[PDB]
Structure formats: C-alpha cells, structure tokens
Amino acid sequence: QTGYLTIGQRYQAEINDLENLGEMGQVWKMRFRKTGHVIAVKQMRRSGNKEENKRILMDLDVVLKSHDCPYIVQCFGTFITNTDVFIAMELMGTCAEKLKKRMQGPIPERILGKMTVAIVKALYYLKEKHGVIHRDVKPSNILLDERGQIKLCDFGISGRAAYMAPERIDPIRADVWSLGISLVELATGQFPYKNCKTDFEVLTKVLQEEPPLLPGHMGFSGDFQSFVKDCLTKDHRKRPKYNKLLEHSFIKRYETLEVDVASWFKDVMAKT
C-alpha cells in the first residue's frame, strides 16, 4: 500500500513523480507530473517531534479506515522513504475559519445547513463504524472546496480547545457541543467567548453562563435555532444522541434541499 497513488485510476508512482507547488498555510500542494492532477501532501519527517508524529499517524489511521465516508478527507496514497513519510490526500479549498475571515461577516444559514448535515454524519460514522470520537470539532477542522464538498479533516487526538462540552470539563456526545459553538461562531461572525483572556476563563463561562444561543433578529429559521439549542444542552444526558440528531427537522431540510455551495465558495474565494 506504499508507492501507489489512486486519484479509479491507480498509478505506481514515487515521491519525485510530484511537483512541489508550495506550502499551504507541513502540508504541500503538489502536482502529479504524469497526468497533471493537483493533490495535497503532508510530510512527516522521521526526526520530527515524537508527539506530533504520533498524532499524524493516528489521523492517517482513521482516514484510511474511512475510505467509504463521503464527509471525510480521502487519502490517495502513501510514500515511505528512509527519512520521511508522505501522505497524499484530496486537495480541498480552505477551512471554515478562513472562510469566515474572508467573508468579514456572518456565513449564510443555507451554507451552514449543508455544513451541519455533513459534520453530524461524519461524527456519526466515526462512532458507529469505528467507535471513534473526534474531540476537537471547530471551524478550522471543516474543509470546503470548489466543488461544494464539506468534510471533516483532523483526527489527530481522536479517541476510541475552547469548544469543550460541559461534561468534558466536569465529568459520548461531547462533539455535539463543539459543533454548536462552531455554528454560533460561523452564523454570527463572532466567537461567543472572545472577551476571555485565558483558557480557564473560557471553561468557567461554559459552566457558569447560559448556553450561547443564536440571536433572534438575524432571520434565522426556527429549525436552525432549535438545532443549536439542542447541541448546546449543558447536561450531556439530555443532549440527544446522533440517532436523534439525524432526525432533527434542520437536518432533514438540508438533506433534500439543493444549495449551491460551490458557487458561494467561489464567490467568497474571489473576494479579498
């Protein structure tokens, strides 16, 4: 499973069959010299940090297991040298965190609806088919592309950080609270805990204050405010499992609705 790159068509290639087009944001944007396809390649050096390499290997482990989930970044191949490990992956556009900064404002609900559906099914696929919890859902971990695809990416600390659930600071569905905070941030353009100066102060506001719900004067649908209210339940026992979440009216609306995510993505990317 090393030395092959499958971008249907499988190619027996190596590392220098790729052209380095620069670093993204270590993830390289590389071009396959044989055909011309552009892919994303992460480089893990053997002399790198021991903790970082362990987190990279755990992320690739989950990615290789989830080759059938359409809401997870697919890996095309792997190259192992005497000094490095190159992980070829699907080239996405950018993360929702960078989409918010370029929008310089709120992200429309119809875009977040398709985003919500993709993230819950990815988190539900991880707990069902692999017993995986993500434990780090945030806008920087939500990748978009030019074709309108929405996928979850980082599984470096997945199990078998200001988005922490109340049950995770004072002890399942902890990833649901992180999704709710991410939705409020992307829907309002403001992080609900931006005034905090330390990590601990964020944790005290989570347990002492009411859940940061969506405003009511921005035209948000009733189903959108209901879904965020359910995700931001402070007691994890009343927070619904993924089985009940996938039956929410906000989920069912955007499972069927056709939303032009691709053109909205290209329109935002064109702006400066």
Least spacing, CB of residue 156 vs ligand J0E, in Å: 8
40 binds ligand J0E (CB under 6 A): yes
Residues in the chain: 272
**Which range binds ligand J0E by CB under 6 A, 6-14, 88-96, 125-133, 256-264?**
88-96
- Please check whether residue 63 is in contact with residue 73, taking contact to mean a CB–CB distance below 8 angstroms: yes
Q: In the window 137-196, what residues touch ligand J0E (CB under 6 A)?
A: 140, 153
Strands 94-95 and 4-6, by their bridges, are: unpaired
Query: Which of 65, 98, 236, 248 touches ligand J0E by CB under 6 A?
Result: 98
1 marked among binding-site residues? no
25 marked among binding-site residues? yes
Query: Which of 30, 69, 85, 92 touches ligand J0E by CB under 6 A?
Result: 92
Residues 241, 252: Cα–Cα separation, whole Å: 16
**Which range binds ligand J0E by CB under 6 A, 6-14, 84-92, 211-219, 230-238?**
84-92
136 binds ligand J0E (CB under 6 A): no
Task: Identify which of residues 42 and 65 has a Cβ nearer to ligand J0E in the complex.
Answer: 42
The backbone region for 63, taken as left when phi is positive above 0, alpha when psi lies in -120 to 50, beta otherwise, is: alpha
Give the three-state DSSP class for 23: strand
42 binds ligand J0E (CB under 6 A): yes
Q: Which two structure tokens, joined as six digits, stand for 107?
A: 């992200």
**Of 59, 136, 154, 175, catalytic:** 136
Cite the DSSP H helix spans in the chain: 50-65, 96-103, 109-129, 166-169, 174-188, 199-208, 222-231, 242-245, 249-256, 261-270
For every residue of 94-135, DSSP letters joined together read: EEHHHHHHHHTSPPPHHHHHHHHHHHHHHHHHHHHHS--B-S
In the residue annotation, 136 being an active-site residue is answered as yes
Find the Cα–Cα–Cα–Cα dihedral 101, 102, 105, 110, rounded to 10°.
-110
**Which range binds ligand J0E by CB under 6 A, 87-95, 102-110, 111-119, 231-239?**
87-95
* Minimal CB distance residue for ligand J0E: 95
24 marked among binding-site residues? yes
Strand order in the sheet with 18-23: 10-12, 4-6, 75-80, 84-89, 38-45, 27-32, 18-23
Q: In the window 193-212, what residues touch ligand J0E (CB under 6 A)?
A: none
73 binds ligand J0E (CB under 6 A): yes
The number of residues that bind ligand J0E (CB under 6 A) is: 18
Task: Identify which of residues 102 and 244 has a Cβ nearer to ligand J0E in the complex.
Answer: 102
Residues 98, 265: Cα–Cα separation, whole Å: 12
Other Cβ atoms less than 10 A from the Cβ of 53: the count is 15
Which residue positions form the known binding site? 24-27, 42
Q: Which positions touch ligand J0E (CB under 6 A)?
A: 24-25, 27, 40, 42, 59, 63, 73, 89-92, 94-95, 97-98, 140, 153
Q: Which positions are catalytic?
A: 136
**From the annotation, which residues make up the binding site for ATP?**
24-27, 42
